[PDB]
Amino acid sequence: MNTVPFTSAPIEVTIGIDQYSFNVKENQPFHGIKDIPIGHVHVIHFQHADNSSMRYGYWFDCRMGNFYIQYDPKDGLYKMMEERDGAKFENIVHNFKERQMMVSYPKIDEDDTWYNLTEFVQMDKIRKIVRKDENQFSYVDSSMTTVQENELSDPAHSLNYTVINFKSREAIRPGHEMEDFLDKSYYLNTVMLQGIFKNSSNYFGELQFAFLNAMFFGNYGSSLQWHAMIELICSSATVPKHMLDKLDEILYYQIKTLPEQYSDILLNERVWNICLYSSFQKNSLHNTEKIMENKYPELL
Amino acid sequence: GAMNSSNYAELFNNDIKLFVDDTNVYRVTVHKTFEGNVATKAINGCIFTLNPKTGHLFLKIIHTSVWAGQKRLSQLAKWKTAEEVSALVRSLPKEEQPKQIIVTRKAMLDPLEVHMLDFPNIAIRPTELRLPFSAAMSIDKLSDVVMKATEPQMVLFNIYDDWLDRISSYTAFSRLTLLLRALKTNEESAKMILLSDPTITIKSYHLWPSFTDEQWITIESQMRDLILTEYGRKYNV
Numbered sequence: 001m002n003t004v005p006f007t008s009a010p011i012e013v014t015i016g017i018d019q020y021s022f023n024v025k026e027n028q029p030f031h032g033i034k035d036i037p038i039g040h041v042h043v044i045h046f047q048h049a050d051n052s053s054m055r056y057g058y059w060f061d062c063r064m065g066n067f068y069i070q071y072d073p074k075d076g077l078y079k080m081m082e083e084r085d086g087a088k089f090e091n092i093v094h095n096f097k098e099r100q101m102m103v104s105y106p107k108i109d110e111d112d113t114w115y116n117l118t119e120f121v122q123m124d125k126i127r128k129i130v131r132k133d134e135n136q137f138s139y140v141d142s143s144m145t146t147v148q149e150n151e152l153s154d155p156a157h158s159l160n161y162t163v164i165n166f167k168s169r170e171a172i173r174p175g176h177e178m179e180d181f182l183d184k185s186y187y188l189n190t191v192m193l194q195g196i197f198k199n200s201s202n203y204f205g206e207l208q209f210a211f212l213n214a215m216f217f218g219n220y221g222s223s224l225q226w227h228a229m230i231e232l233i234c235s236s237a238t239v240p241k242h243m244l245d246k247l248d249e250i251l252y253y254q255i256k257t258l259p260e261q262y263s264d265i266l267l268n269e270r271v272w273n274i275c276l277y278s279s280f281q282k283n284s285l286h287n288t289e290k291i292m293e294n295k296y297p298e299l300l
Numbered sequence: 301g302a303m304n305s306s307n308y309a310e311l312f313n314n315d316i317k318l319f320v321d322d323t324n325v326y327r328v329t330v331h332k333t334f335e336g337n338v339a340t341k342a343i344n345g346c347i348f349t350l351n352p353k354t355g356h357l358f359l360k361i362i363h364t365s366v367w368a369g370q371k372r373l374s375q376l377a378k379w380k381t382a383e384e385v386s387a388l389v390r391s392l393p394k395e396e397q398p399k400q401i402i403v404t405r406k407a408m409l410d411p412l413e414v415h416m417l418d419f420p421n422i423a424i425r426p427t428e429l430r431l432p433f434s435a436a437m438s439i440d441k442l443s444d445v446v447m448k449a450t451e452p453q454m455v456l457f458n459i460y461d462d463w464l465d466r467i468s469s470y471t472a473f474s475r476l477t478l479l480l481r482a483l484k485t486n487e488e489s490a491k492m493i494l495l496s497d498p499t500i501t502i503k504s505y506h507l508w509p510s511f512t513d514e515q516w517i518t519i520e521s522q523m524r525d526l527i528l529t530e531y532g533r534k535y536n537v
């Protein structure tokens with residue numbers, strides 16, 4: 001069980017760690033988060049009490065280094081940093097635990113939610129979507145735009161999601177125009193899975209990462225990417241059976257975790273009604289269809 | 301964006317553009333079977349592709365053999381239309397290719413856009429106008445060549461005959477729109493108006509009668525009379 005210490009908490013802030021959150025008062029004696037489960041990526045995220053504008057945060061994996069948070073009064077935010085001196089770090093953490101100035105990652109033993117939301121998400125792939133190679137962790141916030149969003153303006157601060165565009169030459173084989181537009185199996189299986197992602201685990205990892213950035217930061221381009229990756233599968237007549245079964249599980253847990261009051265902005269009526277009721281896969285997403293109909297029947 | 305009353309003059313500027321109407325591509329008669337069920341029989345159709353500035357009409361005849369063994373023909377018809385328009389564009393010299401294509405029905409937008417991905421600089425546009433091009437098959441010479449075709453065929457016409465020698469393309473399009481609106485609302489009456497006087501003939505190389513300027517004013521008035529009536533005869537007014 002790993003630890004992310006905080007140097008201090010000089011400004012009042014709501015802190016998130018994965019799907020949990022807690023409020024820290026201005027200059028409260030808060031020195032970090034302990035008992036973080038090893039084996040998963042994690043996200044630590046922030047919303048200041050004064051400025052609910054810009055939710056922001058850091059994706060990290062404690063197996064990749066010793067990370068801590070320190071407020072920067074010049075740039076005005078909580079920054080993640082790596083401590084290279086492992087003895088200084090253990091010594092800092094042990095002192096903060098002894099004084100009981102850390103919150104415990106509050107995982108219920110029965111609870112597989114975080115695993116289910118991050119099953120295919122890998123830190124190495126996050127770092128290729130969020131390019132900042134000198135750090136082992138990745139910063140995301142509400143305002144960052146995606147590469148595809150930038151084609152329709154700072155490239156260093158972008159989300160380099162895989163570009164999906166259903167009316168593109170990559171998507172449409174000359175001479176198969178109607179066939180490939182109405183049945184996107186070629187684009188899914190040959191172009192994206194075999195060609196770009198290599199396997200469905202990498203495809204699912206990017207889909208899960210896009211959803212989580214949409215949910216935790218309200219990142220609009222992430223929401224677009226999540227829905228595009230769902231729609232590409234649902235609009236394919238030919239999809240491996242294991243992928244459909246896994247997609248149903250992925251979406252089920254995403255819909256289960258979504259805040260009920262954000263469903264209006266985070267769910268695209270057209271994609272979901274098409275996927276659940278008109279698409280080739282209308283009858284392949286039993287768990288997802290059942291939770292959608294019981295939790296968000298208005299959208300449909 | 302969409303073409304409407306507000307940007308109507310753009311049709312007659314010097315940027316090449318084509319209207320595409322697909323309403324006569326897939327045509328059927330519905331009939332009873334011996335078992336008392338209903339069946340369709342396709343008949344020949346056509347794509348109506350028109351330059352409104354010059355009057356040049358590219359009439360692609362759609363022979364019934366293109367539907368043999370195919371499913372979901374109304375959907376296929378839109379994609380066949382887009383395939384043929386795309387082939388037409390590629391067949392034209394670069395300097396004759398259109399800068400915009402305006403489809404008369406919004407369901408043609410995605411089929412045409414996908415078939416024209418190679419031409420990112422050709423704008424595909426809908427329109428808010430309820431243009432009467434479906435009545436093109438009420439023009440006798442056009443209906444004749446479509447129904448006689450035994451194979452796919454492209455036939456070229458000037459739908460304005462020689463009018464542009466005497467009137468502008470704005471006026472030519474207004475005249476065409478009045479004639480087509482008449483024919484669509486009451487074909488028999490419209491055709492009686494156009495042919496009643498046996499001394500005014502249709503030249504072999506024309507589609508419409510050889511009206512003098514004064515006779516066109518009378519004709520157009522009579523077409524204006526027909527349309528407003530039928531609009532009463534319909535709504536009782």
Ligand SMILES: CN(C)CCn1c(=S)[nH]c2ccsc2c1=O
Nearest residue numbers: 308473474475476477478520524
């Ligand atoms: C398709 N064009 C725009 C219609 C031309 N046009 C014609 S023929 N007659 C008429 C009569 C009253 S108003 C008016 C009029 O504008």
